Design a protein around this ligand. Sequence first.
Ligand SMILES: O=c1[nH]c(NC[C@H](O)[C@H](O)[C@H](O)CO)c([N+](=O)[O-])c(=O)[nH]1
Ligand SMILES: O=c1[nH]c(NC[C@H](O)[C@H](O)[C@H](O)CO)c([N+](=O)[O-])c(=O)[nH]1
Ligand SMILES: O=c1[nH]c(NC[C@H](O)[C@H](O)[C@H](O)CO)c([N+](=O)[O-])c(=O)[nH]1
Ligand SMILES: O=c1[nH]c(NC[C@H](O)[C@H](O)[C@H](O)CO)c([N+](=O)[O-])c(=O)[nH]1
Ligand SMILES: O=c1[nH]c(NC[C@H](O)[C@H](O)[C@H](O)CO)c([N+](=O)[O-])c(=O)[nH]1
Ligand SMILES: O=c1[nH]c(NC[C@H](O)[C@H](O)[C@H](O)CO)c([N+](=O)[O-])c(=O)[nH]1
Ligand SMILES: O=c1[nH]c(NC[C@H](O)[C@H](O)[C@H](O)CO)c([N+](=O)[O-])c(=O)[nH]1
Ligand SMILES: O=c1[nH]c(NC[C@H](O)[C@H](O)[C@H](O)CO)c([N+](=O)[O-])c(=O)[nH]1
Ligand SMILES: O=c1[nH]c(NC[C@H](O)[C@H](O)[C@H](O)CO)c([N+](=O)[O-])c(=O)[nH]1
Ligand SMILES: O=c1[nH]c(NC[C@H](O)[C@H](O)[C@H](O)CO)c([N+](=O)[O-])c(=O)[nH]1
Lengths: 146, 147, 148, 148, 146, 147, 147, 150, 146, 146
Amino acid sequence: ETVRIAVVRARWHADIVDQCVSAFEAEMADIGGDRFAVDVFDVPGAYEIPLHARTLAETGRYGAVLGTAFVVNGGIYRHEFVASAVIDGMMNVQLSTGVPVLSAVLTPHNYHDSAEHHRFFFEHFTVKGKEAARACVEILAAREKI
Amino acid sequence: ETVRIAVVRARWHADIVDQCVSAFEAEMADIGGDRFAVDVFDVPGAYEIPLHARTLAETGRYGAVLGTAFVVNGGIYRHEFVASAVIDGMMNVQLSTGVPVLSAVLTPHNYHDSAEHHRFFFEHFTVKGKEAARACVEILAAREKIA
Amino acid sequence: ETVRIAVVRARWHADIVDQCVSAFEAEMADIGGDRFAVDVFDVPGAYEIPLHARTLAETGRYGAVLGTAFVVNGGIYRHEFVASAVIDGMMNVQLSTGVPVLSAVLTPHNYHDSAEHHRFFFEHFTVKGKEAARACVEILAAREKIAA
Amino acid sequence: ETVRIAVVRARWHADIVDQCVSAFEAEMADIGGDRFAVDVFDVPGAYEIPLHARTLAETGRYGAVLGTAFVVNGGIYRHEFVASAVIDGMMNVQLSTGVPVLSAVLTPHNYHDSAEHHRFFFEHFTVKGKEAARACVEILAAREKIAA
Amino acid sequence: ETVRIAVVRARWHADIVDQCVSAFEAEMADIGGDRFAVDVFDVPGAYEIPLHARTLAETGRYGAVLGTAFVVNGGIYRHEFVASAVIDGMMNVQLSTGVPVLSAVLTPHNYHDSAEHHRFFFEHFTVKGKEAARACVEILAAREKI
Amino acid sequence: ETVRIAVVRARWHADIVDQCVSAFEAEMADIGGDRFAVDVFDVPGAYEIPLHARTLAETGRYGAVLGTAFVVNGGIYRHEFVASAVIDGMMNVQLSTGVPVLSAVLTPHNYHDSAEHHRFFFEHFTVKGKEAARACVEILAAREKIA
Amino acid sequence: ETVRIAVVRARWHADIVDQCVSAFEAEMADIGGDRFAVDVFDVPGAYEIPLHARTLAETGRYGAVLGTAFVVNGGIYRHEFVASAVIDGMMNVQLSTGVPVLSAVLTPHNYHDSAEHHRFFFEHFTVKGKEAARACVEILAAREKIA
Amino acid sequence: HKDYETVRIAVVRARWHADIVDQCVSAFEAEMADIGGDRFAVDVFDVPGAYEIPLHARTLAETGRYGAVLGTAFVVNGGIYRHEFVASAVIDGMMNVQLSTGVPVLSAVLTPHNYHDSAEHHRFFFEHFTVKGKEAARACVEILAAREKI
Amino acid sequence: ETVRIAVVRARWHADIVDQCVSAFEAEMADIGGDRFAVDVFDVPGAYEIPLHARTLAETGRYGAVLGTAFVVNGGIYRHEFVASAVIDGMMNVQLSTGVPVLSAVLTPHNYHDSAEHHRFFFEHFTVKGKEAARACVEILAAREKI
Amino acid sequence: ETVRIAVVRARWHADIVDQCVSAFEAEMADIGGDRFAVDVFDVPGAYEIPLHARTLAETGRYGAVLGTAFVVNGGIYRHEFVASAVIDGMMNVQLSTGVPVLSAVLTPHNYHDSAEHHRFFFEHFTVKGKEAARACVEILAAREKI
Ligand SMILES: O=c1[nH]c(NC[C@H](O)[C@H](O)[C@H](O)CO)c([N+](=O)[O-])c(=O)[nH]1
Ligand SMILES: O=c1[nH]c(NC[C@H](O)[C@H](O)[C@H](O)CO)c([N+](=O)[O-])c(=O)[nH]1
Ligand SMILES: O=c1[nH]c(NC[C@H](O)[C@H](O)[C@H](O)CO)c([N+](=O)[O-])c(=O)[nH]1
Ligand SMILES: O=c1[nH]c(NC[C@H](O)[C@H](O)[C@H](O)CO)c([N+](=O)[O-])c(=O)[nH]1
Ligand SMILES: O=c1[nH]c(NC[C@H](O)[C@H](O)[C@H](O)CO)c([N+](=O)[O-])c(=O)[nH]1
Ligand SMILES: O=c1[nH]c(NC[C@H](O)[C@H](O)[C@H](O)CO)c([N+](=O)[O-])c(=O)[nH]1
Ligand SMILES: O=c1[nH]c(NC[C@H](O)[C@H](O)[C@H](O)CO)c([N+](=O)[O-])c(=O)[nH]1
Ligand SMILES: O=c1[nH]c(NC[C@H](O)[C@H](O)[C@H](O)CO)c([N+](=O)[O-])c(=O)[nH]1
Ligand SMILES: O=c1[nH]c(NC[C@H](O)[C@H](O)[C@H](O)CO)c([N+](=O)[O-])c(=O)[nH]1
Ligand SMILES: O=c1[nH]c(NC[C@H](O)[C@H](O)[C@H](O)CO)c([N+](=O)[O-])c(=O)[nH]1
């Protein structure tokens, strides 16, 4: 059977987020055999991830939902409220829909979009993207065992 | 196709808040294709945004809602609770009604009601107000992409 | 046609809290008076507000409730967990009842129950109390505008 | 008729959490004679309080549930997420069942297991226990005034 | 009759999480005799525990579920949002299903994966496993008295 | 006989700072009565106090020196360093010159240029001045006891 | 040949402070008796302690000096700068003078002058006073055993 | 002698964020001229970073050619290393200098709460620094005036 | 040619502190022997270290002075003021007298008097003792290369 | 005629500290070869830098001194006290001796000895070495202008 996995990515810091989405989309598709299928959906910001995962999840056409974004402190406004709301949101959604939802919504201790700062998280996100895909495979598999 | 967007704006720091609401409507007009009509509703403070956003969402007349407020650390009482309750409340509202609720409820690191602070944000809210418009047009259309 | 407002006031630092309450009724009467009526109920502390607000809310007899308390850090136990539950609580109550719940539940950055401190908030609560009255009238008048 | 109150006490720092329970029962009988009865139930830790309370509340046997526990920072792991999910839990339970749930789940700013620290709180939880009795008696009296 | 306990253990820092798991099974079978039986389930991260616990809880085969993971600040991203939502998630899962969910989802003040830390927790997690065991046997007994 | 006390005040938040000074002068007179004489000197801000105070103490013309300023977090720059450099600074000057230097350089937890904050501290400062006046008289009387 | 120890106590919260001073004297006479003598000196607040410790020290009549005070965050202004400047200043004094300076200048994590707090430190300062007593005797002996 | 004399003011400006720092420098000279005019003269000295200001301010100060020295730098938190220790050492160091040399050293070394090298951040401080420069000037003129009264 | 090192140890938490002292003496011999000799001096608490280190340095019999103590957060009073004064104090002392003053005055992020914490540091202090042994030897060697 | 610069480098995280030293040397030779000579001295830890720099400064042999170290929070002890006494110390040293003392004693926000952290700072220190070089040349030239 072909399991559909949806990726809901924010477009803020698209540059870095996409490094996670591509890495993720590779581990998922590359284990090719029509096993999994990755549909990617655009979302303005992290705050827009929960409701989108829910609507997607409620179609019953997906075995899992990945939420991904980079939620940082830009120096002017505080980012914790939104970060908190999104992480708690995806938890509420999956418990609600019974559809697993993995979190690739990251918040670093520091991010000044400096040349060095940008380089780093741009490369570490591919790492996290790979992590998420292998965790996705594992959770679905761990569910058959129930 | 015609779409109605309701804006729920608080009146604390109306001054600054309104800069976002108007920047919101203008942007909405440009990148909208004349598809959107916008109704604005006045609410005392940020804490009054979730319940109002929900009541509006339930009418079924709107496509999305934009809550916008300036919740700051006034230096006398703590603002996190209210700030959190409001951002948590709006997430809560869109999940239960299925109606998108965008946040323009901002809390800065520092706002001491000085000429510099007041001016800065009076200016920046125009930037956010525009960001909110794009977010609104983007998610609505994104949702049209879900079969 | 009279519209009632319920005021759930905690009894901790009653001195300071009541100044918010009588500043609420006076302002309420002054800006609306004739059109509104205010009933006041006592609760041990702020933690007991959400439930009371919900009960008063579910009687259908009220157009809105005002939650008001003074939740401080007394230097022994942490207060953030309670204050947090009361604020999310009132949001939780108003969202499922549909009845507006205004918040006058305040937590100061610092309050050591000293003459100057006590004196400061005793005075300031009447100011917040007057802010609550306007807020209450406005949200009720604002809802009146929604073409529900 | 006699009103039943369920005390759900935690077994962590049992020694301290009990000065509260013991004081709560004393004051309860002190200001209610035969009007109330107290049933004490044991629970492993603070995190088990919410479900137990919701379960006890749902038997319709109790007029209120008192949750009590000492959730300190052991200096090894972080205690906030627990303290927080428990105060939120007790609020979640009371709003859903409709039964008052008072909090005696205190978190100090500091507790290092020093003899001094233990002595202080061993004593102070008695103060809290007494406060919990008044709260419990009053809240219930307060709901009666509500022409539900 | 026999009561079955389900364990949901995250694989992050698995090496440490497993000292607690094996100390739980050991302590359980010890203080409970042939009264209980334990079933272990593997989850990628701490964030997958709530939904797994709810799903396991909804099979009506377990009298309780134990979630166990090590959620730490790795010095790159903020960890409190996930921690926060796991502890809330389990509390939410137990309140809705009625099945107790004991928590062994620990978060230390400091963990730098040095030699000192890694050893301290590899060891202390055994202590926690015993504690979770007694907690489990105790709460189920406390409920029988209602 | 009379004793000279020198007051070095910053001109930042002069409004508030002067309530401490006038209060200091009042208390100085009420409990000291013609025994003490107060000379006031202006300085741009708190950072200039240590040197001015030292220079004064070195004239050997004052029994003691008071330093007073309102050092706050205006919400844009960090105030700690300066407040700290000045509290240690005054310590530095009195330990080396041998002349007592009393501190009325206060830093509030919060101050936001809101009526509430301004009024509170404008009012409270006369209290701090009163204390410094008493501390001033007391420290000198004590030094007297050191045989 | 009697050894005199000079205790310099602040007067803020004198209530609690005097408990440390009295316990210090008791213990000091218990494990010493006729070997040491205690002279107490009153000072306005903690900030005035370092200079008084120095003056006293420089008379060469004291084998050591004990500066004790209660320095709490009263909720309005910040108390770290003054504590810091007092604890550091005493260190400055003993290093430049060679006269040991023991500290009983405590700053609690939390103090609201409520019934319970007051009682807690009113008692505890007794413990501290006896500790300072032992520390005082030991240090002088440890130095006695150095070329 | 009587005052028909010129007082020299030396400015020790850091070069990190030269852009922003410079705005404080020009506004200082302008203000200075505006109120001081002919009774003061300003010499500007470049320095690598804020940490180098104290020793430089001290060498200048000890030549005796200046009535006051103004140290100016922009010590920010780049998000990688902590800037507190340096900022604190530079602020304490100057105080150290002025007390030892006796020559007034005014501080224009600022550490903002949040600086993330962005358009608005940069623009905010590029503008605000002129405000701080004018303040530095009035402070410099006044402190010197105030001393003359002693 | 026997260089003498003086150790100033606080008697507060004397138990945990002495594990650094003895570790220091063994490593010193293990890598010095004949070359250096250690002399131990007891002081009431940390705050008394600076003045003692000075007095010792000034006798001119020692090539280096080691200051050691455990300065923790007691949950009742703030400890930073005293720690800060001692680290600065020893620095102050070495720059004036010219005798190197090494630091084994440690402050743990968290230390509650419990068996777990007490054991950790009772054990970790020997590590610091050996580190301090090699530091002392190396600094004295490096100064000769000048 | 040749001006000599002295470098006092700590040996903690030597691997990383040395990146700054070599980068420094290579830049010091690149922007003014022959005019400057760099002498490197080893010290155990950052806390040893002030005294060493002072002794090296007091010989009149050097036109300046560079202190370099990596002072991090290891999750057990607080590092603020040493970092501060070392940064204040070098300032205290250059004001008394008059000899310039540049600072390369860095303290990061987060360092957890791991693949990514060590990598990031290992390379970044090259950037900090070059920066210290320019500052060295520039400050000595700035002084000539007096
Ligand atoms: O995805 C992100 N969105 C952000 N925007 C907030 C939110 O996601 C929505 O776009 C909008 O606020 C209302 O819908 C961020 N910040 O503001 O910092 C961020 O860091 N990351
Ligand atoms: O919109 C805001 N409302 C505020 N008022 C709080 C709340 O929104 C309600 O007006 C009232 O509290 C009762 O409902 C604010 N502060 O108090 O600081 C603020 O910053 N912003
Ligand atoms: O009541 C408490 N329970 C504690 N345990 C947490 C929880 O209540 C459960 O016992 C167990 O975690 C499994 O659910 C505590 N600490 O861990 O520190 C504490 O201080 N107090
Ligand atoms: O209203 C308040 N209630 C308080 N008590 C908490 C709660 O409101 C209940 O009285 C009790 O906890 C049991 O329900 C407070 N403190 O404890 O500090 C406080 O400051 N204010
Ligand atoms: O169990 C853990 N999982 C972690 N991963 C988070 C989450 O559990 C999932 O694996 C993944 O995020 C997608 O759902 C952790 N950190 O990230 O730090 C951690 O410390 N512990
Ligand atoms: O006395 C003060 N001076 C201030 N200026 C700093 C300093 O006192 C000098 O005026 C100037 O920095 C250069 O000498 C302040 N702020 O900047 O915020 C302040 O709050 N209080
Ligand atoms: O002894 C104290 N003195 C205090 N006064 C400060 C200082 O000791 C002097 O009395 C006065 O500031 C001028 O010399 C305190 N506070 O201000 O908070 C305090 O807590 N304790
Ligand atoms: O003037 C500054 N110098 C800086 N460099 C530090 C120092 O001023 C010297 O240039 C160098 O460290 C050697 O002394 C800064 N930061 O590092 O962030 C800064 O923000 N501002
Ligand atoms: O060495 C220590 N001394 C301590 N005492 C302080 C000081 O060192 C002196 O013994 C005494 O205070 C008089 O100077 C400590 N605490 O108080 O917590 C501590 O942790 N460690
Ligand atoms: O140079 C460093 N030295 C360190 N040790 C302190 C000091 O440098 C000496 O080695 C020793 O303390 C004796 O003086 C460090 N830590 O402890 O973490 C560190 O990060 N960096």
